[PDB]
With several copies, the nearest count.
Chain A
Amino acid sequence: GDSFTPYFPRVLKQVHQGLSLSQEAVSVMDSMIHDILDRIATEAGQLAHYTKRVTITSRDIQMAVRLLLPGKMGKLAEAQGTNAALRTSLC
């Protein structure tokens, strides 16, 4: 199947370069990423349904993640997402 397991070492190396994941830490991390992605996705979905729209846009994900997370980490996630959005917009 398709998952995020070959990526956790990459992202880890940029924060704690002198470390390494186990063979199951990657598995639990992958399951966690999967289910929180599913949570955010279904939130954005049943959010866009309320406004009678049928699609899911970046604004929907933004509203969903701000509605799903409290202040600090929420706003930091918003900042990261907006930075990525404008970065893609550049190219």
Chain B
Amino acid sequence: RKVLRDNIQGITKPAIRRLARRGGVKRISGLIYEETRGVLKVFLENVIRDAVTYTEHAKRKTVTAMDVVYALKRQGRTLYGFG
């Protein structure tokens, strides 16, 4: 149907570099990339797990912005601009 494989590479090296520049750091070691990919992976794991549980409780096959904003609010990292 919609089988998927290896999207973690979507967060490319220059994207991580631009994110770090936004963070305000000059140099970057080569080993930073894969581990920050893993960090993003586990963060998204927790966030979207809470979100999808919220959805399932509502008996909705789709995820809405309210779902993820509630998940993030519970995560101790609230969000604005969406309801």
Contact = CB atoms under 8 A, between A and B. Distances in A.
Given A50-B66, A67-B74, A32 B80 contact: yes
B63 to A, nearest CB: 13
Interface residues of A, dominant DSSP? helix
B53 A50 contact: no
Contact of B54 (A24, A27, A59, A67): A67
Give the size range of B's interface with the partner: 10 to 19
A42 to B, nearest CB: 11
28 contacts: A27-B81, A27-B82, A27-B83, A28-B80, A28-B81, A31-B80, A31-B82, A31-B83, A32-B80, A35-B73, A35-B78, A43-B74, A46-B74, A47-B54, A50-B54, A50-B57, A50-B58, A50-B66, A51-B57, A59-B57, A60-B57, A63-B56, A63-B57, A67-B50, A67-B53, A67-B54, A67-B57, A67-B74
Given A24-B81, A63-B56, 15 more contacts: A27-B82, A28-B80, A28-B81, A30-B83, A31-B82, A32-B80, A35-B80, A46-B74, A47-B57, A50-B54, A51-B57, A51-B58, A60-B57, A66-B53, A67-B54
B67 interface: yes
B43 to A, nearest CB: 14
Interface of A: 24, 27-28, 30-32, 35, 43, 46-47, 50-51, 59-60, 63, 66-67, 70
